[PDB]
Amino acid sequence: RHSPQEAPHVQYERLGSDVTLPCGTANWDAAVTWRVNGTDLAPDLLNGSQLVLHGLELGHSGLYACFHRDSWHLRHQVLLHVGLPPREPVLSCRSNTYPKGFYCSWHLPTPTYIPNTFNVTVLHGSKIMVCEKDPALKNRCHIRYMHLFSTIKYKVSISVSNALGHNATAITFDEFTIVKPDPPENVVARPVPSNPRRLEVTWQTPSTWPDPESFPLKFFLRYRPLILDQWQHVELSDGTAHTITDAYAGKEYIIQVAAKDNEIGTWSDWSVAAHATPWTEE
């Protein structure tokens, strides 16, 4: 190779493959020894002056250096990395804010040990989109809406490549099936001294929704004791308040609620928790 003062090269190989590592432009009948991480190898894996590796695994990656026989004079260096070809990515778009834009996440099912390159292209019919990204994460560009009730479906495609292969995937959807708000926060329960079988339950709206007045939501309330394991399902109308009348006398409870728009979207995840027992007269 080049001068021994150089940095080692980067060479990627497959898992279970076979590859030979020569000592640069040296001859075949030259005295050459190899060392991995400072440990010398056995002469059984040397085909003259080259290094022959059979059955590459995850433990064969590292710094392979070429030295003179029984010496510390460096000749050639190379960094070997073992990885797998990429698989079909898992693309999923979600509209956390219906009046505003949406976002799309993607990830590989089987992890790879080498860096990857991703490129996403979003189409609204025959037009082009930019999807300027502003997240704290990556692998998202947050496509922003421009028209409403356009009846035209969106097309998103993400392509991934590697030093050993490449792959791509694409999905299609509308502007209504990807709508899913965030669960409400600070769901607190309070006792009621006025009634024996009562519990004050009040929640809020998700902070991500910028325009809730023009697009109301429907809440699904679930209240259940801690020992019966029999959950109850009660769907509510417009409002962030409820009143239960058939709860326990003294035992604890867990109440969780979700959110969903009036005509579009899907049901959201449940809230964190709730714990309160009704008042006891003594």
Next chain:
Amino acid sequence: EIVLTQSPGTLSLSPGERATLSCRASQSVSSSYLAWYQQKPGQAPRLLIYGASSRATGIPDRFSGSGSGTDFTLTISRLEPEDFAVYYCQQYGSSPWTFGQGTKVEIKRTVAAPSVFIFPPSDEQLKSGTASVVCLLNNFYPREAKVQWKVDNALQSGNSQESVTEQDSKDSTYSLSSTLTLSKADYEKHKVYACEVTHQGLSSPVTKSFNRGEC
């Protein structure tokens, strides 16, 4: 590797009719990554529909596609004089970029009887050391036709080449050129040379022959 099979090989239709093409794969196409192309004789391919259901920028509204998984069909509303070309399909998602065999669309007309002519080798080529006998076919239709060579009632095989031209612009006919290549030592040994051509527009095969040494 996924093999793309198109059917049929050649589609003969008149301008103003509906032309539906097909391109069947070996496995299911992932994410509907199928494209259609159009290539004219002597030009570059032209992308028509990407994703098997989305037209490209500038492509007319008469082109339309559909399909799911393995069986995809390309349907044209009505044919135009500039719509007769070769179309291909592209597969991606489960293998590297591969193309199909191709489908040729030609103009349909009435059957025509060929006018067969035969030409003996010239004296210059004979004195050089080779003898080529050419049998000419002119203004025939359709393309399906074969020519039989007979050298003194002996069928010849493996020593003949055929060349055909494209469709004409006015009458939309064909013309084929079959040649029999023999050396000087093989030409003067025989006496007669015949060219028998059969065709759909002919009741019985026509035979054109000449005798060596009298012309």
Next chain:
Amino acid sequence: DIQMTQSPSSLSASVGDRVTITCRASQSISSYLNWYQQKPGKAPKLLIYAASSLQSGVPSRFSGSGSGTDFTLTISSLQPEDFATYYCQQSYSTPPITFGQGTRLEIKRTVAAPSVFIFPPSDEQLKSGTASVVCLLNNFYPREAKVQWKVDNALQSGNSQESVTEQDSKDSTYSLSSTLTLSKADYEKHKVYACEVTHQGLSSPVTKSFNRGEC
């Protein structure tokens, strides 16, 4: 990348003397240096590899020392069969392999005076269109010499080519020849031609002139 610098580019010394050749590099190289010997009209021959290891079949008078950035090629006793050009090659960075500019060794002798002569153009040179008058230098030493071309004490520049010979095998002298190329117009416009040489062994420049129409 690595640039090799030799010092000096030419050395003159007699036989039996100690000659030292220096080769300088652009960076720090441990021992990756090779010394070659190339004679006029033959391929180069390796003398010392690793700058300190003599090759088999090389006399013991050759030696090499130095490391890091500066090296040294020394000869104990100079022999008549040792006058040749020497190069130093680095084997640290590949590609590229860089060589030195070369160091040619010459024979040492006393300073001698040249014998200068001029030759007017011939009669066959007149009817062509150009006239070339040459000025000869013969048996001078050292090679460093400068000649003058003046037509009626007029200085010329860029209109003359000169070439020097190698060292003679008997007394190791030099010979140089310079040709003045001028067409017939400028040749017939002037009449007097001169050539004066400047040399170390000459107290005053030797004058050998002629005029047109007199010869």
Next chain:
Amino acid sequence: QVQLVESGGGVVQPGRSLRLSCVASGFTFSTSVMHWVRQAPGKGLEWVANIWYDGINKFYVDSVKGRFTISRDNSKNTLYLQMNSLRAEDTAVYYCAREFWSAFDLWGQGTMVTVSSASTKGPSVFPLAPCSRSTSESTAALGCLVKDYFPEPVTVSWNSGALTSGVHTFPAVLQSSGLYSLSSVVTVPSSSLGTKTYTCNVDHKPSNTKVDKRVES
């Protein structure tokens, strides 16, 4: 407007090397994926190589692995393709793509690459005429034959371009001798063979050969 221009292809011998170039214009070359698609004479398309926008990831087909090398330059908006150790099955017309939706959106005009040891030779013309002399049907046929020429193409004209009705020039065929061959025929009435003269003009620019033949009964 957007366009792709290819250059750097020509006739070469087996075992030599070539280098193609694809210059882009009208679009952002630094933010697009480039491809190479070839097409053999009388066959379908075939993908050859692929390179991304940055230029580190490169892909090739199993038929050209170890012999071809793709490269690009984002500053000059060009696309190179180093072809080494060319064989007989490498004769095709290469193109360049853009891969908008994995569909090869843009294409170039192409470049023909011929890899053979045909030992370039000038063409030869032989007259073709029916040896029988029959005036039964009022229409006859004549022509001139061209054989043993290399490379393509060859333009054939009749009467110095004064005759174009009824001329049928057949495409060139690749014989086993490594040289091409074609033929030209003209359909003229039978009475026009005794007074009017019919000459075919054959030219070959790679060899600078112009040979015309007097073809008549």
Next chain:
Amino acid sequence: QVQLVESGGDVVQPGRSLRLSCAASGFTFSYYGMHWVRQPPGKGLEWVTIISFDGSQKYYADSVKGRFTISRDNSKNTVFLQMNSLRTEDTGFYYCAAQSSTWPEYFQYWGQGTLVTVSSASTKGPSVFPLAPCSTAALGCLVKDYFPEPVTVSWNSGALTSGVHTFPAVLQSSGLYSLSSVVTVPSSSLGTKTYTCNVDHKPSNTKVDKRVES
């Protein structure tokens, strides 16, 4: 016993490409790597390219990158060098060498080399002109406008060799070379002793004799 021969070098215009051939013998050709070093006339050596012992690693210099291509066949022991887009500055003697197997590496074997002249000027015939003055005198004849080298100059059918100084060829700007030969004999000879030079040229088929006398 190790022999290295080269072939494929002569005058070629800068518009055509050339290919060199290097056949090795006397050692295991498959175990050694072959080098290529060129040397222009009147200058030092210059490395060009390097190929591995098997044929996987190939490196070229920036001066000939993109135009040269090196290959080798271990079965027939022949080295190839496809030189494309030649130019006049590429003129010089190319040498076929092989690296060493020890440490550090060096050039162990060398060949006789071949000459590759690249100039647009084609073959031309030489024209001679006598040179005579107008003690000890000097006589000679001038040779100009010839291509290519070499040219044999003798005097009196080779019977006179003392005092003859033939100058090397000078590449003029016209694409042709020129040289001269001077003979110095005592001044008591110009009355009876007449001298003539013999110029020979094999490629251009030229043999010219000229009687030099004033």
